[PDB]
Write a protein that binds this ligand. Structure first.
Ligand SMILES: O=C(O)Cc1cc(I)c(Oc2ccc(O)c(I)c2)c(I)c1
Ligand SMILES: [As]
Ligand SMILES: [As]
Ligand SMILES: [As]
Ligand SMILES: [As]
Ligand SMILES: [As]
Ligand SMILES: [As]
Length: 253
């Protein structure tokens, strides 16, 4: 903990300390419990009819918002199982959640990318294509998520890495309106540090793994920001009635 810089300067790659291993277990379990069973959506997935999602294709949009509420609640459930999140005020809770929701949902869809069928599986239950997701309301956001998915294939991420990534997205102190900024940053730094150490232990046969991984954090933030804009365009090209209450609550002030 106190011998970070010096440990790096020598050339050693510090692995998780006992305190961090404990933190890693909590976050991983948090993710695993609120996410689909690994390597299961593959056999249980259902491809969306090729005729849907071939303006906003309201039919495809319909199919997506039908399962969007559970996807969102899974993210709240994840956040709930992290003590650091619970230590925070109600106002900060909501702000943090409204800001990372689409970032985490996208990472989750992205890691369930299948190069064979060239599809993503939403909620591990609905296999969709780039065009289908694009026409269903996401526009270029679909492109961004699929591009992310194709890229993540080489990273070979496990439940721990995806979980830590989600924790880093969640604890974003720059979220506007936050009140407990400096402690939300302490939490994030803590996650980032356990994360880097986890990566050293994992030793991916990939060059500059950590920095490349960090760039993904930025891409996920962009996907989120970009989706905020896609939501505005949705409220115009879509019947207000096809917007589940929680969907509206989380993305719009
Ligand atoms: O797969 C998961 O667990 C989470 C997940 C669930 C869904 I439904 C999803 O698609 C979206 C997201 C935002 C949006 O405005 C529209 I219309 C569709 C994505 I991307 C990810
Ligand atoms: As709680
Ligand atoms: As509140
Ligand atoms: As509470
Ligand atoms: As505070
Ligand atoms: As974009
Ligand atoms: As955009």
């Amino acid at each position: 903990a106190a011998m970070e810089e010096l440990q790096k300067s020598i050339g050693h790659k510090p692995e998780p300390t006992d305190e961090e291993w404990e933190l890693i277990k909590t976050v991983t379990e948090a993710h695993v419990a609120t996410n689909t069973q690994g390597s299961h959506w593959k056999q249980k997935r259902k491809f969306l009819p090729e005729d849907i999602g071939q303006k906003v294709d309201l039919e495809a949009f319909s199919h997506f918002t039908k399962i969007i509420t559970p996807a969102i609640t899974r993210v709240v459930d994840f956040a709930k199982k992290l003590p650091m999140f619970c230590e925070l005020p109600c106002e900060d809770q909501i702000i943090l959640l409204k800001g990372c929701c689409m970032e985490i949902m996208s990472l989750r869809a992205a890691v369930r990318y299948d190069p064979e069928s060239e599809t993503l599986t939403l909620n591990g239950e609905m296999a969709v294509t780039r065009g289908q997701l694009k026409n269903g309301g996401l526009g270029v956001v679909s492109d961004a998520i699929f591009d992310l998915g194709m890229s993540l294939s080489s990273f070979n991420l496990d439940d721990t890495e995806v979980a830590l990534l989600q924790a880093v997205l969640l604890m974003s102190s720059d979220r506007p309106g936050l009140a407990c900024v400096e402690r939300i940053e302490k939490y994030q730094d803590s996650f980032l540090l356990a994360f880097e150490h986890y990566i050293n232990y994992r030793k991916h046969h990939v060059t500059h793994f950590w920095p490349k991984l960090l760039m993904k954090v930025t891409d996920l933030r962009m996907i989120g920001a970009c989706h905020a804009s896609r939501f505005l365009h949705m409220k115009v090209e879509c019947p207000t009635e096809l917007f589940p209450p929680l969907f509206l609550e989380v993305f719009e002030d």
